[PDB]
Amino acid sequence: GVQVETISPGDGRTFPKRGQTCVVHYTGMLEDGKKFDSSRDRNKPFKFMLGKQEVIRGWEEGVAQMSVGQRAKLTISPDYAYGATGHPGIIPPHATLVFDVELLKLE
């Protein structure tokens, strides 16, 4: 599944709804700490619409539990991420992924 561990609290009131665009900053790592990507390195938040099926299930389920302003670590099991396929060249098969995600804004 997806485990959400808070790094910094959000407002505890404004939670993303299906159809809303979440603007997030993230660092994705494997369990050993190995960073595979970060929007913080790009200095450009990543946007996705909740419910559009355009990010992995662990993000849909994990970011919907976060309130605006919250920074959290999302540990996502393979079946909530890329399962057996992995992602060609970047994520191996059956990889648990760890994301540091900051929910910046909802548009």
Ligand SMILES: CCC(C)(C)C(=O)C(=O)N1CCCC[C@H]1C(=O)O[C@H](CCc1ccccc1)C1CCCCC1
């Ligand atoms: C693998 C891309 C990488 C390394 C940059 C990354 O850190 C990542 O893993 N991301 C991108 C940031 C949102 C979370 C995740 C994702 O949902 O990607 C979706 C993949 C969509 C998908 C969902 C479910 C099953 C398969 C695929 C993409 C966002 C657009 C860019 C490509 C990745």
